[PDB]
């Protein structure tokens, strides 16, 4: 009757299932009760973050939420508890369940420093901001690493709760702490008593609500990233580019130009990593692939640099188009390292919010002139981030003003 297997051998689960009790929630698996809803709260917790393939857990007692996390593919999970008996059934959990995108660590969040874990697309915070002695603090440091899902419980509000450290928690110090930490952008999706009370609220923060209109529309100014110096230089150096075809008599295949007298119009440094530059390093600086990660995935690889440029008075616009269509929305995109000040009557971009989510075959007119055409101002620094299926143009620049951007294209290397 035995000698034979299982459907890992429904004996060894049991033996391993036994040797790690005392379980607090149980182990079932296919069934079977080995030890006396996750996948509900996941389900929702990638309706709130649809792009996160980084997620990080904390307080995975068990891995129960962990590998409910884990189901939806092309994501990286890392999980903090605070007790090594929960890590080894958290572990065992994931070497049945053959979970082998998650990796679990021991680690106290009270004092730990989280800049070591490094940046995170989204957080799970299940259960346990009631368990922290400042719990606003743990909140901050989850906010320095874009996005939280927050299920926790809240006191109504008569008895006074003192008043510690700024925050008397009850509901107004909750979403004080929430707005403190750097989440800007609050959505309750389900909550009351006179006493202990149940809240689950998600939490979006600078750069989170960016991904959400990049995700939405397709277009972000995602603000600056340097810090000071370099963006100067790669000014600099871009004007160097600019007046070798003006100043000098500069002549190439990647110098596009365009009718009578006055000389041809420069409008594209095309391979620009390519070219004789003193600060081409720059191009490969780690803040722009970091925040290209941000927004699309996190293995990001750079695949085209250029330079458009936008003289003064002569220029002329550019049609509407798709840079690429033959890839999946959210996939690739392209940033723009805008180093100088483009407004509406500047020639600055111009974008059909949600025509990067439409067929593959379209007819570019209709998108254009059905809209709306929405403009993206910009100073000098900010960096505008847009899918590559976003239909996007612009018209001409008539004023005095020059208007040059640095246009780097990011993708996943599948
Ligand atoms: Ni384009």
């Given at each position: ?8 051998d ?24 080995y ?18 393939t ?8 068990e891995?129960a ?14 999980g ?8 080894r ?12 995108n998650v990796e ?7 004092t ?5 874990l ?10 346990l901001?009631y368990?922290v ?9 989850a ?6 899902y ?23 110090s ?16 389900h909550?009351?008593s006179?006493?202990?009370c149940?809240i689950?609220?998600?939490g979006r923060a600078?750069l989170?609500?960016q991904?959400r209109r990049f995700?939405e529309?397709?277009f972000?100014n ?20 600019i ?12 110098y ?22 003193a ?8 803040e ?18 250029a330079?458009v440029?936008?003289?003064?008075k002569r220029?002329?616009?550019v ?9 999946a ?7 723009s390292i805008?180093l ?11 974008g ?7 067929p ?5 007119p ?12 910009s100073?000098?620094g900010?960096?505008?981030?847009h899918?590559?299926?976003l239909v996007h ?17 990011f993708?996943?290397?599948?």
């Amino acid at each position: 009757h035995h000698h034979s297997s299982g459907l890992m051998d429904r004996r060894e689960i049991q033996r391993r299932a036994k040797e790690l009790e005392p379980w607090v929630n149980g182990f079932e698996f296919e069934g079977i009760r080995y030890a006396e809803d996750p996948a509900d709260r996941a389900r929702a917790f990638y309706e709130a973050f649809p792009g996160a393939t980084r997620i990080l857990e904390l307080g995975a007692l068990e891995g129960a939420d962990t590998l409910a996390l884990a189901r939806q593919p092309g994501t990286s999970i890392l999980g903090l508890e605070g007790r090594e008996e929960n890590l080894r059934r958290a572990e065992f959990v994931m070497e049945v369940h053959g979970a082998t995108n998650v990796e679990l660590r021991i680690a106290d969040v009270e004092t730990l420093d989280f800049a070591t874990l490094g940046r995170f697309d989204a957080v799970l915070c299940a259960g346990l901001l009631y368990h922290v002695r400042e719990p606003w603090a743990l909140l901050k440091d989850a906010a320095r690493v874009a996005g939280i899902y927050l299920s926790t419980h809240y006191w109504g509000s008569s008895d006074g709760l003192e008043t510690l450290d700024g925050y008397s928690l009850d509901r107004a110090s909750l979403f004080a702490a929430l707005e403190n930490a750097g989440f800007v952008e609050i959505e309750v999706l389900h909550e009351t008593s006179a006493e202990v009370c149940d809240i689950v609220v998600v939490g979006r923060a600078r750069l989170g609500a960016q991904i959400r209109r990049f995700r939405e529309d397709g277009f972000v100014n995602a603000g600056p990233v340097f810090a000071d110096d370099t963006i100067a230089r790669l000014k600099a150096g871009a004007i160097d580019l600019i007046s070798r075809f003006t100043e000098h008599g500069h002549v190439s295949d990647d110098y596009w130009n365009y009718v009578e007298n006055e000389a041809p119009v420069l409008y594209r440094i095309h391979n620009l990593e390519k070219q004789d530059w003193a600060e081409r390093e720059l191009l490969f600086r780690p803040e722009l692939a970091e925040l290209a990660a941000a927004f699309v995935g996190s293995p990001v690889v750079p695949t085209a640099f250029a330079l458009v440029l936008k003289e003064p008075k002569r220029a002329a616009g550019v049609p509407w188009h798709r840079d690429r269509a033959n890839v999946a929305p959210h996939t690739v995109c392209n940033l723009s390292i805008c180093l100088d000040t483009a407004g509406p009557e500047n020639g600055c971009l111009e974008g059909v919010p949600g025509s990067h989510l439409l067929p593959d075959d379209i007819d570019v007119p209709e998108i254009r002139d059905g809209g709306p055409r929405v403009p993206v101002p910009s100073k000098v620094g900010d960096v505008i981030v847009h899918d590559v299926r976003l239909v996007h143009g612009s018209g001409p620049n008539p004023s005095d003003q020059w208007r040059r951007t640095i246009v780097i294209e990011f993708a996943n290397p599948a």
